[PDB]
Symmetry: C3
Subunit: 294 residues, 3 copies
């Protein structure tokens, strides 16, 4: 780190020529930040309790970190450049280097959002996506977009890909009152071009159907009769399928608020290999479509 | 000053360190210009975008906040820790105290994303999840991965959990053209294990089927003749189901751009409980499977 | 350069000042790179990860950016105010001005996540949402929402509002091992009121069924018989729908691992307008519900 006379600063310029690729790390209130082109790292904030002010300025003044990006092109030349607001670039391994990596026990996270709740709270939001078309027309908006780079530039191989992955914690977690997934606006259309898989189970004891049992396949296996009771929590719209693979018969019952509706008033399957489709319609309309054993 | 083996510049080290959080540089005029930077909790950027350039180095030149996190390890000792590029924590209630909380009117949000529109905009992205396997092999990729704390370490309870909620805004918004959820790659293998609910409708008058009503279960009610007309918008591949629960007949009509197809050119139902399943197919092939009344 | 005491770094502050307008760094190749400050926060970090420590305090040490929000409120008067943690406000055009814009080739991204791979890796997460109810009870939690400003506040229009978009990259991308979307907790209940669209195709030669083809509709065209073989990859819980669209019969074959199962061991459709519903059940039970040609 000296002042030298070099041509890189001009025909006869002078410069400070610190001679290490990892130039000044700088010391913040405890940590070496990075090259002297960065800012503070750890941010904390405490908000003051107030009333409901559903305004953008109000939530801005309550926010802990505010990032805003404004683009202003000319009317003659509306630009076509990609303008992200927040760019999080997770990188593993230095470019041009074949050193190290991360193993299975650990994992790298592009963005970790953790909810820390220990006080009585009404609702908590993990994310939110709002669009405000104040003045103009937007041709198309997408909340979540998935892009994978073409193989002509990326020679790597991805063994497995998951769009969305949800584990099971029936043992470790019991305090969840109810977990669901709601789409209250039927305007959307699901253009699912792939396959699908549904749950299946074999019945041997009498069961009470709820909203979770919507749509699986039931196998009546055993010798004693198996009774299925449609609980009051079952909502119109779901459907269940039953097929008998054994000699045991299948009995059906409904909640008092549901009135049985069937062709011929049949309350059980006719025989083995007989199909039974149970469908629920508004104001408690239970319809059981039966198929002959033969 | 001085050069140190900090180990914060990789496994090797050998970086240059300055022991104060602010450094400066004297320009030609004689006044100091800061080399470093430190912004508060509010950040603002204005960009005069040039022509389209899909280069990551060019892309980061327009972002208002760029975050990188590089993981480096020895080739013989790959890392096994967890490396989140960005960590955001939403804490309610000071630890060691249960005082206070948030009711229904106020909702704590881990991450807020929103947009204002004031100029003609082509398209807008609420998020984007890219991946570039530039050189090496990656085993598993996950876009969104939901985690619930185990109850052995969590004495509290969660009454309701929603992995995704989309409300209905029939009244408040009417400027939206279409609502879509596209999966343009049939190579996707969706795996489900929960339940499903299908919207159900009771038909009583003339109806022109569109994209929104696809996949539903329709009920024939009343005595007057009910006609279902398939408009041009109905793309191939959609499926519809109809059940005649009364004596009202059901007629089927197709747009002139496609030809109706059924069993024996039967363009109507046969009677009560005569179910018709309509499946559209390319080249204008609209097939209808008709079920006998008895 | 020497540390000095100046007011330019705050009232009664100290700094590290270089007395030359140009400061240079020697990179790994010996070239000189000028050190300069751009616009926007460039928060960056490099981590030499230790062993696996799955603790919040431990993991927070490896984050390039940490945001902490504590909404402590009084016990007798809990708050009812919306309090986000990270607020992102991307907008186009200043309020009150219609000048300029951004056409379709360009776009704005609310949060541009990224992931570059240069070294072998085990697991990568695009994002992660976690809830930790240590002490108290939470009423409702929703991971991700979708809120659109009501028209009484927004005067513009939206063309398309895509909840989730996934394009097709068969050409550019062929190094992907597989594409999946797994839900391995059966307790989940979904309420999809919108339309559902699946993939349909017409057979022309002998084919082998895969997981991607589950839940599709097929028709046989021509005169030569077409053989459909269930591949070894087929697992229990799938379903396939087949209809003979022409005079050519469709023969059914099963891999040695799976066992064929049908009413009367009917391995092919009798004639045109026949129906088959092939469902795979535990222990390799490939059971096919059959409907005759008529």
């Amino acid at each position: 780190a000296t002042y030298v006379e070099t041509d890189a600063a001009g025909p006869g310029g002078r410069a400070y020529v610190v001679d290490v690729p990892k130039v000044f790390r700088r010391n913040a209130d405890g940590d070496l930040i990075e090259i002297t082109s960065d800012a503070g790292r750890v941010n904390t904030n405490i908000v003051t309790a107030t009333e409901f002010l559903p305004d953008y300025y109000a939530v801005k003044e309550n926010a802990a970190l505010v990032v805003e990006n404004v683009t202003a092109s000319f009317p003659e030349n509306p630009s076509e450049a990609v303008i992200p607001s927040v760019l999080v670039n997770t990188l593993v391994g230095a470019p041009g280097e074949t050193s190290g990596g991360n193993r299975d026990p650990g994992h790298v996270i592009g963005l970790f959002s953790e909810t820390m709740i220990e006080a009585p709270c009404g609702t908590a939001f993990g994310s939110e996506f709002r669009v405000d078309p104040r003045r103009e027309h937007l041709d198309v908006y997408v909340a979540i977009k998935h892009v994978i780079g073409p193989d002509d530039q990326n020679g790597g191989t991805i063994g497995d890909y998951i769009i969305e992955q949800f584990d099971d914690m029936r043992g470790p977690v019991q305090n969840i009152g109810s977990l669901q997934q709601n789409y209250l606006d039927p305007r959307l259309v699901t253009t699912h071009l792939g396959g699908n898989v549904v749950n299946t189970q074999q019945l041997t004891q009498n069961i009470t159907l709820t909203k979770q049992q919507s749509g699986w396949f039931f196998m009546s296996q055993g010798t004693t009769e198996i009774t299925v009771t449609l609980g009051p929590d079952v909502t119109p719209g779901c459907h269940f399928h039953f097929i008998q693979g054994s000699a045991a018969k299948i009995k059906f019952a409904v909640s008092p608020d549901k009135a049985w509706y069937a062709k011929g008033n049949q309350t059980e399957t006719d025989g083995q290999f007989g199909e039974c489709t149970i469908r629920v319609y508004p104001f408690g309309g239970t319809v059981g479509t039966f198929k002959s054993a033969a």
